[PDB]
Amino acid sequence: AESHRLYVKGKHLSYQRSKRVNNPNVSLIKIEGVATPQDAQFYLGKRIAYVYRASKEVRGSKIRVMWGKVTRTHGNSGVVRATFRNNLPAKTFGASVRIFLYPSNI
Amino acid sequence: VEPVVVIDGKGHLVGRLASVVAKQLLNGQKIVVVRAEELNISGEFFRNKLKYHDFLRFRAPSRIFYKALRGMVSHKTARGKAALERLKVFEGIPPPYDKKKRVVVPQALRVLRLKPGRKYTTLGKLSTSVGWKYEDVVAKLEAKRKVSSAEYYAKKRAFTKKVASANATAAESDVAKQLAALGY
Amino acid sequence: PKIVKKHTKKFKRHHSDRYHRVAENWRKQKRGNISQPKIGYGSNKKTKFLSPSGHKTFLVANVKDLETLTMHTKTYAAEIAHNISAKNRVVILARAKALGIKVTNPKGRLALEA
Amino acid sequence: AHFKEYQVIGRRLPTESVPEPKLFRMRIFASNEVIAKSRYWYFLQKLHKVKKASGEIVSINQINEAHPTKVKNFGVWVRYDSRSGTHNMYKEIRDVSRVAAVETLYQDMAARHRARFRSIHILKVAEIEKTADVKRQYVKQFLTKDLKFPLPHRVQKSTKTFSYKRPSTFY
Amino acid sequence: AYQKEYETAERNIIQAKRDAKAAGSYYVEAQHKLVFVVRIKGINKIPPK
Amino acid sequence: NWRLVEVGRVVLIKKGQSAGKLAAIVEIIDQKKVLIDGPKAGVPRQAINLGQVVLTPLTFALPRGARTATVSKKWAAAAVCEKWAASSWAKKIAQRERRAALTDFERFQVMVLRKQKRYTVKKALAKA
Amino acid sequence: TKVSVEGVNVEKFNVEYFAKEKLTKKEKKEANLFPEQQNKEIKAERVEDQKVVDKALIAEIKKTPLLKQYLSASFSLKNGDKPHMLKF
RNA sequence: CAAUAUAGAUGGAUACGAAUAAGGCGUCCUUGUGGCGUCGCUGAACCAUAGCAGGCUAUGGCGAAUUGCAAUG
RNA sequence: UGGUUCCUGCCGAAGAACGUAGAGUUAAGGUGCCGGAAUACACGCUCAUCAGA
RNA sequence: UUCACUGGGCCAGCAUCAGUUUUGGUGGCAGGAUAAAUCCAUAGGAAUGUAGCUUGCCUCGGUAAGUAUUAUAGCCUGUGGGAAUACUGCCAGCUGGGACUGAGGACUGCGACGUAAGUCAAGGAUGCUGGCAUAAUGGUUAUAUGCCGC
């Protein structure tokens, strides 16, 4: 009744980078309540949506969605790599991005 | 997990808290830092006094911590400016934040990071020693706040004591045992 | 098949924006942030010369040229030359739709009235 | 890494008209057998004029602790090079097993003396059996009757970002 | 025959070590007449020898 | 009131192969390391650094350097398994284990029973 | 959480039963260029299948406590819900 | 144009203070630097949370479908 | 002395030999924040009235 | 003209495969001092000496310091019995998740399972479903973001 959330919100942290060269193709995601890569194994392959709201109304709504998926873990803290269909605009660093449970193993 | 995070500054280190907050603002978490005058610096008063001196060749503790924090963020970028626009810093706890809980950052605590038998430095004494003539104004407001907060906490403890009594008399019921069966 | 392109953009001369007298064709200089043409960018030999429709283009001047694409309809696609007069373009279009050959550029120099 | 005891025997080669030389046995603390054999030759050349081409290893062996449950007390002889001059050193170590004591000894020698694993040459590790042969005061500090003390470092790894508790070293 | 040969060879070497332990003497091993070598360094700054 | 590292101090290894098993300090090694054994819990006798373990406020009398069969004897005669289970902290640990053990229909029953208990408490409230 | 399927004779309808229907005569020339919208209703046989399955399924449900109300309520993720930790 | 959103809404920002080689809570008295017990050892908490994105009626009774197997919907 | 006009391929002197991509693994170098990655773990030492990194 | 069936391309999702890879869970072996330990059996030993006893100060019984080697705790060492486990290696053991890839294009080949006919994960991907003409979708520019650029 009060909640309708069938996803986990998580921050678009950054692009994959060295000190001087960043890859816009791979994006970095912080899933809330995940500190270990073993917990992030649960989130492998899961379908991700970045939800944002446009000014114009494209098809019956002003809200648009980018999609993509988790590929692999990144680092020790449970930070998670992600690849989308189109890359992110990078002004969405630190933005809330929805991570859905399908494709569910359980 | 929280929209606006309210962080007390009492008993904390400058740079470690600055690093944590500077990371979270670039992560997008909105942060207000309160009671800034009670931040603590490693080393004695005098060393840190000379460090502010040879830097100086703004006196408020908020300006000091803002300086330290702004050094860690790439401030010239638009993203860094948005991250700084997420931030609020206050000496003392002004309203409305007095009525809300203040979290602490354990990896920046003085009592955990410092070995006992080390000199530290209070930021408010430092600011007053370098020309911030408002520290007595702070403690005067904070004394009234602690009075009203002690009143609030004394009321809150009595009411939760009543809640404890009501939960105690709610016990031994079969719905309570079924919660016990489910674990609650 | 699945057409790989290997390079979406174009290959421009160094400092081509800095001067209006300097052209944008590739001329070899005689940092590495400029994409330089080389044989690694050469497309796959099956995929080479393919439209987004998936055909190979073929310039057609008149009907006798159009009849040369009679057997290879699914592979090629006819493109009317730029200098064909509008009397001949409609004849070419009628003949091509009779042959069932995809014209790359219909509606060139032509309108549909009534 | 974590070392291991090694019974290592060498016999430098029985030549023509010299059958069966004297089977020199040592005990090496090493992470593996390979560096154990290298250290064995590195001592055997210091014993007398051998080379690894001159002789051979008889038997490489790991030897465990007979009683790895009891806390034993040890007197250790070490020689090493403060680079220009050498000097011996006698240390006393309270430890459950031998090889962990040698581990902690290498850590302490690298801490206080800047000496590498190659620079340190173990002379002897032997159990001190009875009490009061502990010449060192700091091991003797733990030989008292009914010894009790509080924990230092009540600080622990908090593992989370923000704390609601205002925590306390409550010990 | 190969698998039987490997099994008999390894049991023979292990039992020879066991016979040295039972006799109280020592067993010496035959030298391994084969190794495998892996390149470690890049092509630059190598002496010609 | 302090806990002290001592023989017979029953402890709890919060981190490791035990990750929570009741053991007991049989002997001390130094300020850093000790000797423990947890033969009732199943963790064997071993040396351990003190960071990997926490002290419990429970204790009992245990002989110096006592062997494992003597250790389990004094453990059972201490009966500190029951004294541990009676402690509210071990109850909380078992509770947070049971909360992870929950099923969604179990969690829905938790929701319903919280509603019903809240109804009964709010009736019990606002009358006293 | 499990229920018994055994009361229901499910086997009748198949993959072919869910095949979405087609039109003929090119939709009868769109009724000569005039659209008609009476086709929205459900076939009654689908409703009858739903009732036949539903009776023997509710008969299974009513033996278990609180399961009807469990199926009626929906599901969402609350604050602190961590599905890698959330055993289901 | 609007009945909206802009660095990123879709359960809740859910309030003592100090000390840390100490605190808190409850209780008792001799109101103390008293005694007793408790607690921490994480919020993994607590509070809220069923009903067409939440229908219509009286533990009940009717409605949901075809948006056809995911595509903000 | 200064200048000396199209492209590509091949041959070509006096930590890592680099066609174009995708995926993985690594050298060196790092892993408080900028800044990607352990405010990991363990043991000792240093409080400097401009250590040290 | 009646009736019946069917439809291209692209982009997806799913299944079964194949190739590369990553991350799990799990089993059976083989070696050691044929693990060492522990546990059990025995004999001595000692103290950071348990019970007992003696003595002295002292809150009707606490202390202390002698005795006292097990008693009203035990420990250690020696020897004998039995495993188990650790570590290391092997498995042409089982099983799971995630990512990337789909080159090639009638058959031939090596196989394997099959009594047989046949089949197959075996000389490189096929099958099912969805969406799409006021398209689907794709491109162009100008701005913004991030990174790099004298």
From Swiss-Prot, chain A:
Keyword set includes Ribosomal protein: yes
Location(s), subcellular: Cytoplasm
Example GO BP: ribosomal large subunit assembly
SUPFAM superfamilies for the chain: Translation proteins (SSF50447)
Free-text description of this protein's post-translational modifications in UniProt: N-terminally acetylated by acetyltransferase NatA.
Modified residues (N-acetylalanine): A1
InterPro entries given in the database record: Ribosomal_eL33, Ribosomal_eL33_CS, Ribosomal_eL33_sf, Transl_B-barrel_sf
GO-annotated molecular function: structural constituent of ribosome
Keywords (A to Z) from UniProt: Acetylation, Cytoplasm, Isopeptide bond, Ribonucleoprotein, Ribosomal protein, Ubl conjugation
GO cellular component, as recorded: cytosol; cytosolic large ribosomal subunit
Cross-link (Glycyl lysine isopeptide (Lys-Gly) (interchain with G-Cter in ubiquitin)): K46
One Pfam family per UniProt: Ribosomal_L35Ae
Main function: Component of the ribosome, a large ribonucleoprotein complex responsible for the synthesis of proteins in the cell. The small ribosomal subunit (SSU) binds messenger RNAs (mRNAs) and translates the encoded message by selecting cognate aminoacyl-transfer RNA (tRNA) molecules. The large subunit (LSU) contains the ribosomal catalytic site termed the peptidyl transferase center (PTC), which catalyzes the formation of peptide bonds, thereby polymerizing the amino acids delivered by tRNAs into a polypeptide chain.
Family named by the database record: Belongs to the eukaryotic ribosomal protein eL33 family.
Subunit structure: Component of the large ribosomal subunit (LSU). Mature yeast ribosomes consist of a small (40S) and a large (60S) subunit. The 40S small subunit contains 1 molecule of ribosomal RNA (18S rRNA) and 33 different proteins (encoded by 57 genes). The large 60S subunit contains 3 rRNA molecules (25S, 5.8S and 5S rRNA) and 46 different proteins (encoded by 81 genes).
Note: There are 2 genes for eL33 in yeast.
Protein name (record): Large ribosomal subunit protein eL33A
Organism listed in the record: Saccharomyces cerevisiae (strain ATCC 204508 / S288c) (Baker's yeast)
Upper classification of the organism: Eukaryota, Fungi, Dikarya, Ascomycota, Saccharomycotina
Swiss-Prot record, chain F:
Coiled coil region boundaries: none
Keywords: Acetylation, Cytoplasm, Ribonucleoprotein, Ribosomal protein
GO molecular function: RNA binding; structural constituent of ribosome
Disulfide bonds: none
GO cellular component: cytosol; cytosolic large ribosomal subunit; nucleolus
Record PTM: N-terminally acetylated by acetyltransferase NatA.
Annotated signal peptide: none
UniProt-annotated location(s): Cytoplasm
Domain of life: Eukaryota
Example of a GO biological process term: maturation of LSU-rRNA
Predominant location category: cytoplasm
InterPro entries according to UniProt: KOW, Rib_uL2_dom2, Ribosomal_eL14, Ribosomal_eL14_dom, Translation_prot_SH3-like_sf
One Pfam family, short name: Ribosomal_L14e
Anything else known: Present with 45300 molecules/cell in log phase SD medium.
Purpose of the protein: Component of the ribosome, a large ribonucleoprotein complex responsible for the synthesis of proteins in the cell. The small ribosomal subunit (SSU) binds messenger RNAs (mRNAs) and translates the encoded message by selecting cognate aminoacyl-transfer RNA (tRNA) molecules. The large subunit (LSU) contains the ribosomal catalytic site termed the peptidyl transferase center (PTC), which catalyzes the formation of peptide bonds, thereby polymerizing the amino acids delivered by tRNAs into a polypeptide chain.
UniProt similarity note: Belongs to the eukaryotic ribosomal protein eL14 family.
Subunit structure, interactors included: Component of the large ribosomal subunit (LSU). Mature yeast ribosomes consist of a small (40S) and a large (60S) subunit. The 40S small subunit contains 1 molecule of ribosomal RNA (18S rRNA) and 33 different proteins (encoded by 57 genes). The large 60S subunit contains 3 rRNA molecules (25S, 5.8S and 5S rRNA) and 46 different proteins (encoded by 81 genes).
Record's protein name: Large ribosomal subunit protein eL14A
